[PDB]
Design a protein around this ligand. Structure first.
Ligand SMILES: C/C=C(/C)C(=O)O[C@H]1C(C)=C2[C@H]([C@@H]1OC(=O)CCCCCCC)[C@@](C)(OC(C)=O)C[C@H](OC(=O)CCC)[C@@]1(O)[C@H]2OC(=O)[C@@]1(C)O
Ligand SMILES: Nc1ncnc2c1ncn2[C@@H]1O[C@H](COP(=O)(O)OP(=O)(O)OP(=O)(O)O)[C@H]2OC3(O[C@H]21)C([N+](=O)[O-])=CC(=[N+]([O-])O)C=C3[N+](=O)[O-]
Ligand SMILES: [Cl-]
Ligand SMILES: [K+]
Ligand SMILES: [Mg+2]
Ligand SMILES: [Mg+2]
Length: 994
């Protein structure tokens, strides 16, 4: 029964046809269970090994390397070489990479906790129903509750299903529905119908939504919906439905994968066309099982030359150290790939209560009477600092700290605030922070009289645990609380009867202490207290009081004003009926006005500056709240979203107002409006989707259950450390310190990290370019020598993995936060950069061929002085008279591959020096600006010497030769490549402008 809020109690009972006094019958429970199912949110399967791993293998590049590993087993089958039969282990290496990388992804998926499971902690095990079987209430399992059941709830109870209230047994029914509205304030429900069919949960003041707990009271209702059909079930559906898109940079890697598969697949067959040298090479033989293997010997090699193996390892470690660096800023990152995505955030959506504000009700202003001389009436107004329940702060008058005990009116104001109060203030030693005990509204009064200290009580050397209620107890011991007249809806106020308990009994006179909504209380105040004295209430006086109260209720500050009064001559205790709550308003008559307090959930001190910093960084901040519109706007003015006097007309909408706009006017309404109030949990997710429709990377910040959908729909979800568990589970990052400025710091770190990522990404990709060009030249000139598939792995994994990781520690740009947010879909390589890498790739790629070619043509220690016919080395066995003065094994000497690998590694170190910047020269950018860069080059070169000057590793590859005749020649290209890139870099820095 969805329209249950708009139908009367009798109409709701008539829908299911059950008498309010008696419960459903077993037949009805059978049928309603076979129709509506059980009352439980469905679980989620989440993970599957057999399918998660294969999903990790679904990527394209891993399909290329995987397709190359088996071929590498085929090359490994070959008994031809075996001496190099033992070197058959390259595929396993090629294999052990994939496996390893795969596992890392699985590990990233290992931490994915079930957020629906966290949402299921808000459904209770047992529930209380009345039924036909038994006159006495039945405590059953809440999952067996079907619609139509008569359900009972009491204090502390968790509501099991969405329930229309039939009769409230207590004076009031206060429910904490922060699960859906994000507000710790407890709403006062009723049984009247709510005619609006499209009312939001905040307006359904006659319903009891599943997952919310009863703050105080006892009531009876009939169940409307169960299971997924409840309002929390909408949250579950929206949390299982919103799939997370791939990281923008990850999308770049994927399309790079596609084009890479195209280019590899086209080159491998493109070699078949240039087969002028394959028409008739052997003396009689042709293409058989031995001959065709060449077309694969290049293939796998070409693959390992194109695939940047180890890039996921480098980005994984880089993002890991980013997580460690932000961890010192109290920013716990749950998803590694999200860090990058935080840099390019264009819009930040944010909750208010608990996120932008402290979620701790604080009394800002207060006023008492000063002088009453005829029509004139002056007031004493005070402001109170402190934005938390902790008794920290002082009272001020005209921006000057003043002791409260000097004003006789403030003493009585604190006396009313302390006695007429059911709440206490506790100090959590485990969390190390003061927590409210009771309602937030009254707790604000408790901490208020803690801040005031009207009797000048020594509280400096007090323990932090006893500091919580130090002054409240002082006031409690002065007047004994006989009984309390509880809050009722008819009079919108509550009162307390107190006796002196003084030295001489109650001869000083009993007094009644009343607090409540302003108009209803002031209308019953026939007297006004001026310090110690009492004067009759008049027109001009109450017009001044109501004037100031109206000035505080609206405008810049939007405080919740409570009026406080006493009764100097209350009636006798033996003539007050305490059962009938409607009579209490007569008991609270003939009052004496005292003062007024103003409450507000104040913002965190760290927020406003953060909003200015995002504004400076081109990031717009949007507030999305379940709280009232006036309150959210008044907070926006303090935060810096709106001006102190800015007219907010078309810039702030409510969920009901938002839904009334055409879908177009909503999608465009998210571009201008910066504040959204009184919204349902679905509305936040809808706004996030709308902002993402503009291809804008948006981030959501929250702390409650109602923020869970948005937190999933946003590209980056940021949860508060003091927030709910379900909000943390559906987020990519947590702020343990609850500070809002660490978001700004986190964005800065993300941008700097990406700026450092383009560097080593371009480095590895360029090395792959040179390798591809080299394998192509060696393939077209018939010289598979000087390169092997095994070594290209170690080069792209170890000797290049270290400098690439070192590039992650480059100093960030100075004016990095004065620039607007980065474009989402923009290439890492542009035309000029693509031209630069296209030239240097063929240059350094031809270097590696020139190593072997030079070792054979112009060399004093290279016996293979062939001079000509070097390209036709395969004929050496069938045309031995052609190749005299040498052995058939000299073609595969250790020096060609040692020199090719040498110029490769050195060109890669110098190229890693070129990767320190894109448009900045090396003369103005000293290489020692990054100690980790030169350190990684020193360690990669040291590991290269370890490859050469050892016994195992050479057996796979080749043997090293002397240096008096070898390193002198590696400098033909190992060093002038820096000059090439230096000219190419000098051109665009000056020729581009003018
Ligand atoms: C040589 C090595 C490989 C892996 C390769 O083919 O990379 C190309 C390639 C797929 C791209 C190109 C490479 O283009 C070339 O190779 C130039 C001509 C072909 C030479 C072959 C014979 C001499 C990248 C490498 O060119 C450079 C950097 O010079 C940059 C970039 O990729 C990036 O955005 C950088 C990494 C994400 C992509 O053009 C990309 O394709 C796209 O769709 C892009 C837009 O992405
Ligand atoms: N944004 C807020 N900031 C501060 N307080 C809020 C806020 N919203 C609600 N409250 C308090 O919570 C109680 C719940 O009332 P409820 O009907 O949910 O809200 P509203 O009255 O604002 O109506 P609305 O939903 O906006 O139409 C009110 O009762 C009282 O103070 C109010 C109240 N009053 O409103 O007059 C009197 C009172 N005593 O004791 O006199 C005690 C309250 N209380 O404990 O919550
Ligand atoms: Cl509102
Ligand atoms: K998310
Ligand atoms: Mg919140
Ligand atoms: Mg309200």
């Amino acid at each position: 029964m969805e329209a249950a809020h708009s139908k009367s109690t009798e109409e709701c009972l008539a829908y299911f046809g059950v008498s309010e006094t008696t419960g459903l019958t077993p037949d009805q429970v059978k049928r309603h269970l076979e129709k509506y199912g059980h009352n439980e949110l469905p679980a989620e399967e989440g993970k599957s090994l057999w399918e998660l791993v294969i999903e990790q293998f679904e990527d394209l590049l891993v399909r290329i390397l995987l397709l190359a590993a088996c071929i590498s087993f085929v090359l490994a089958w070959f008994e031809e070489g075996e001496e190099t039969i033992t070197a058959f282990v390259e595929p396993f290496v090629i294999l052990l990479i994939l496996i390893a990388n795969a596992i890392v992804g699985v590990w990233q998926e290992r931490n994915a906790e079930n957020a629906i499971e966290a949402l299921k902690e808000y459904e209770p095990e047992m529930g209380k129903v009345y039924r036909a079987d038994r006159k006495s209430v039945q405590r059953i399992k809440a999952r067996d509750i079907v619609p139509g059941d008569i359900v009972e709830v009491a204090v502390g109870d968790k509501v099991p299903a969405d329930i229309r209230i039939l009769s409230i047994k207590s004076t009031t029914l206060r429910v904490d529905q922060s699960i859906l509205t994000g507000e710790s304030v407890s709403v006062i429900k009723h049984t009247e119908p709510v005619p609006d069919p499209r009312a939001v949960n905040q307006d359904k003041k006659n319903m009891l939504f599943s997952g919310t707990n009863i703050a105080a009271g006892k009531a009876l209702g009939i169940v409307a919906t169960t299971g997924v059909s409840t309002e929390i079930g909408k949250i579950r559906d929206q949390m299982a439905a919103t799939e997370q898109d791939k990281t923008p940079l990850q999308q770049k890697l994927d399309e790079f994968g596609e084009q890479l598969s195209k280019v590899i697949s086209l080159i491998c067959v493109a070699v078949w066309l240039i087969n002028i040298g394959h028409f008739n090479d052997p003396v009689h033989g042709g293409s058989w099982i031995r001959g065709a293997i060449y077309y694969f010997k290049i293939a796998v090699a070409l693959a390992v030359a194109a695939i940047p193996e180890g890039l996921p390892a480098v980005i994984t470690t880089c993002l890991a150290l980013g997580t460690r660096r932000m961890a010192k800023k109290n920013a716990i990152v749950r998803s590694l790939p999200s860090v990058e995505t935080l840099g390019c955030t264009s819009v930040i959506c944010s909750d208010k209560t608990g996120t932008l504000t402290t979620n701790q009700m604080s009394v800002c202003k207060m006023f008492i009477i000063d002088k009453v001389d005829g029509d004139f009436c002056s007031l004493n107004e005070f402001s109170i600092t402190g934005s938390t329940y902790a008794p920290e702060g002082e009272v001020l008058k005209n921006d000057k700290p003043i002791r409260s005990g000097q004003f006789d009116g403030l003493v009585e104001l604190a006396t009313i605030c302390a006695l007429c109060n059911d709440s206490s203030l506790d100090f959590n030693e485990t969390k190390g922070v003061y927590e409210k005990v009771g309602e937030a509204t009254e707790t604000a009064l408790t901490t208020l009289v803690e801040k005031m200290n009207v009797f000048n009580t020594e509280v400096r050397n007090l323990s932090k645990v006893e500091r919580a209620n130090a002054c409240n107890s002082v006031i409690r011991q002065l007047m004994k609380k006989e009984f309390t007249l509880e809050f009722s809806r008819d009079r919108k106020s509550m009162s307390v009867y107190c006796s002196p308990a003084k030295s001489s009994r109650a001869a000083v006179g009993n007094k009644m202490f009343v607090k409540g909504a302003p108009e209803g209380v002031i209308d019953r105040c026939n007297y006004v207290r001026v310090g110690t004295t009492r004067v009759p209430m008049t027109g001009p006086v109450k017009e001044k009081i109501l004037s100031v109260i109206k000035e505080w209720g609206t405008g810049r500050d939007t405080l919740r004003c409570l009026a406080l009064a006493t009764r100097d001559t209350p009636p006798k205790r033996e003539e007050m009926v305490l059962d009938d709550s409607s009579r209490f308003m007569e008991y609270e008559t003939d009052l004496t006005f005292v003062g007024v307090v103003g409450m507000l959930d104040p913002p965190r001190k760290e927020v406003m500056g953060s909003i200015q910093l995002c504004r400076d960084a081109g990031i717009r901040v949007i507030m999305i709240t379940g709280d009232n519109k006036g309150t959210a706007i008044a907070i926006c003015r303090r935060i810096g979203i709106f001006g102190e006097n800015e007219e907010v007309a078309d810039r702030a909408y409510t969920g009901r107002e938002f839904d009334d706009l055409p879908l177009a006017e909503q999608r465009e309404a998210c571009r201008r409006a910066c504040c959204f109030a009184r919204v349902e949990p679905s509305h936040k997710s809808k706004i996030v989707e709308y902002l993402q429709s503009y291809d804008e990377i948006t981030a959501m910040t929250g702390d409650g259950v109602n923020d869970a959908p948005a937190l999933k729909k946003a590209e980056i979800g940021i949860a508060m450390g003091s927030g709910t568990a379900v909000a943390k589970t559906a987020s990519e990052m947590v702020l343990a310190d609850d500070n809002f400025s660490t978001i700004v710091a986190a964005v800065e770190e993300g941008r700097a990290i990406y700026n450092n990522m383009k560097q080593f990404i371009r480095y590895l990709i360029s090395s792959n370019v040179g390798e591809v060009v080299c394998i192509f030249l060696t393939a077209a000139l018939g010289l598979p020598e000087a390169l092997i598939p095994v070594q290209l792995l170690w080069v792209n994994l170890v000797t290049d993995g270290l400098p690439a990781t070192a590039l992650g520690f480059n100093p960030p740009d100075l004016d990095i936060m004065d620039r607007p947010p980065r474009s989402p879909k923009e290439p890492l390589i542009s035309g000029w950069l693509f031209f630069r890498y296209m030239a240097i790739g063929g240059y350094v790629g031809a270097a590696t061929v020139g190593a072997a070619a030079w070792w054979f043509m112009y060399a004093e220690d290279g016996p293979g002085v062939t001079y000509h016919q070097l390209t036709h080395f395969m004929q050496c066995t069938e045309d031995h008279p052609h190749f005299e003065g040498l052995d058939c094994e000299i073609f595969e000497a250790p020096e060609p591959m040692t020199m090719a690998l040498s110029v490769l590694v050195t060109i890669e170190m110098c190229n890693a020096l070129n990767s320190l910047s894109e448009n900045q020269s090396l003369m103005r950018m000293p290489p020692w600006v990054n100690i980790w860069l030169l350190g990684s080059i020193c360690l990669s070169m040291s590991l290269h010497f370890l490859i050469l000057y050892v016994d195992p590793l050479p057996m796979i590859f080749k043997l090293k030769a002397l240096d008096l005749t070898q390193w002198l020649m590696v400098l033909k290209i190992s060093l002038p490549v820096i000059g090439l890139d230096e000219i190419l870099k000098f051109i665009a820095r000056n020729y581009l402008e003018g």
